[PDB]
């Protein structure tokens, strides 16, 4: 069984929130919604693993960065693009970087410039879907604000929003509205950031515990998840079927992306996550050949197979996976 | 006079060929079209200038990378993705990138992530304007296929077309067909790379001169580049215009873009040029305070005075750039 092709949806690493709580001074240094040093090495150590994987146990990219064989697609974020870059660092490191003729390096440390391509959200024809904020809503109500655990959850926590919105400084009347300032606050958490005045160390948790929870609620429905990752799985789907024919020198491709890419993939294989995607999450399509024109991809989420029920388990034959995108 | 914002836009750095000659055994490495070793280095030197231009002498920008402080944008091409990417290896080198708590550098060499944004040409509101190439033959056909001088140099030439097309072993019918030849043959030069046996010295150099001059030719005409750059010029008259106002963190553009580019963007100004900007040039826009709310805006081509008719010379008022702006 031969590696001849493979696809990684990332995360970016470790960010600033998007957001910053009204009731708390603290100048994120970085800015918000900007990839932090810790994960500019969350990214470079993916690189390194993806090195590993693919140029020295594999061989299906060579050693030195050569034109035809990648594709890097990122979001229109800072994050994503400097996410990007960081885990080419580590993939084609600096050492393996081009020379000019004379035979010294043409940049310091011989660091490898590698092309990450990208589109605004609404222009972009390979990952992102953009949905109508008023048919996101129609979806939304439909498929989870519907549901008997959200109603449940929300029920469990329909007083506190007074207390919170106060003591947070952004309002909250339901559980959507509570997702965003609770992801904040596990940043907050992980920085050891400074929390609202007053806000309990339980109540810390809660809101944190629900708002991951209320956010893979989300993305579990399998009917959001094709209007969201359609595009997405039939690119993925063209690549995977290309790299089968062995004709193209592309081997290999790299799309920036975050968790919501990730959950709402995973989602749309009929595996929906329980737990957030982590930083520096993939999901990975690894086509193999069996030297007898039996193309398999086995599908990895942070090295544990997926189990798919339209292919059985983690490995789905080449047709079985393109007719489960159809 | 102080510098309170600045926009760059340059061209990428040394590259093979689009289109090889058929005619020569000769493989380029890096693939058609994409930047070289030499590129790189080229695009970093220039890092280097604008690090010493605008961290060491001018204060312009932190010594450090700081967010919202700059914009860096490229067209859609490995070429100037991979210029940016170089670019900024020298505005923002290796030992002046983050650090993790423990304190080891973040990244190899203590390296500087700097995000270069992008969008395909029939979606990028930046850079690039999108002409479908059945309109753009309108506008020559006006504006440059008209004129006496594009009609007389495809006369002196028209005789060698099927001796070049053998040759070469590409298809020439009309002037424009040995622009692509002629940048190709250039580039053949530099690089050492062979020649078409029998293609004769004295022929390579006027095939060189020639496409040189009918791409500038193209360029020329100021309504051609009204269509290609007033977008490109009403978002640098924004980005100048926002400066003015000195509420943002945002002082320092960078477009990475190419040889049209430039050129498009002088004619535009009423600046056309006569020959083709070299590898890693650079068009500069600097707005200055003088001290009691009259900006003035400097423009230069490689370090050069650019002499705009409509401001009289090299330096613009902001006011009356953005009005040149909004003229077209
Ligand atoms: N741990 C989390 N808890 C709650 N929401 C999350 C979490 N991780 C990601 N999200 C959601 O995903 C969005 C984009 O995630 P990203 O760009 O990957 O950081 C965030 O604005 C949230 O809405
Ligand atoms: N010396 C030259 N001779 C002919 N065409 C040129 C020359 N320099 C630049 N160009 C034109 O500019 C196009 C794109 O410029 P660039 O991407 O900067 O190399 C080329 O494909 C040519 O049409």
């Not at 606050?185 to 920085?191: N, P, S, T």
């Not at 990895?300 to 079985?320: D, F």
Request: aromatic share 10%; net charge negative; hydrophobic share 35%.
């Amino acid at each position: 069984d031969k590696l001849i092709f493979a696809v990684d949806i990332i995360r970016h690493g470790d960010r600033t929130p998007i957001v910053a709580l009204p009731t708390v001074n603290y100048q994120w240094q970085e800015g918000l919604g900007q990839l932090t040093a810790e994960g500019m090495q969350q990214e470079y150590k993916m690189g390194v693993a993806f090195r590993k994987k693919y140029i020295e146990e594999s061989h299906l990219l060579p050693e030195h960065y050569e034109y035809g064989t990648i594709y890097v697609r990122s979001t229109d974020y800072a994050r994503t693009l400097m996410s990007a870059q960081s885990l080419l660092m580590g993939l084609y490191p600096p050492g393996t970087g081009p020379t000019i003729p004379a035979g010294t390096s043409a940049l310091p440390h011989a660091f490898q410039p590698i092309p990450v391509f990208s589109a605004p959200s609404k222009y972009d024809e390979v990952i992102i879907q953009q949905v109508d904020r008023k048919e996101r809503e129609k979806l939304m109500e439909q498929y989870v604000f519907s549901t008997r655990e959200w109603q449940q959850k929300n029920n469990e926590l329909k007083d506190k929003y007074p207390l919170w919105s106060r003591l947070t400084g952004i309002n909250i009347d339901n559980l959507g509205d509570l997702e965003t300032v609770g992801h904040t606050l596990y940043i907050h958490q992980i920085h050891n950031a400074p929390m609202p005045e007053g806000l309990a160390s339980n109540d810390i948790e809660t809101i944190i515990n629900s708002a991951e929870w209320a956010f893979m609620a989300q993305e579990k429905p399998q009917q959001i998840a094709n209007v969201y990752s359609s595009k997405l799985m039939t690119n993925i789907a063209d690549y995977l079927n290309s790299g089968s024919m062995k004709k193209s020198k592309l081997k290999y491709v790299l799309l920036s992306a975050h968790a919501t890419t990730i959950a709402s993939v995973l989602s749309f294989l009929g595996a929906p996550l329980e737990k957030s995607p982590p930083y520096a999450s993939n999901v990975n399509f690894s086509l193999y050949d069996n030297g007898a024109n039996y193309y398999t991809v086995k599908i990895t989420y942070n090295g544990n197979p997926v189990s798919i029920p339209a292919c059985g388990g983690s490995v789905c034959e080449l047709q079985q996976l393109i007719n489960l995108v159809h």
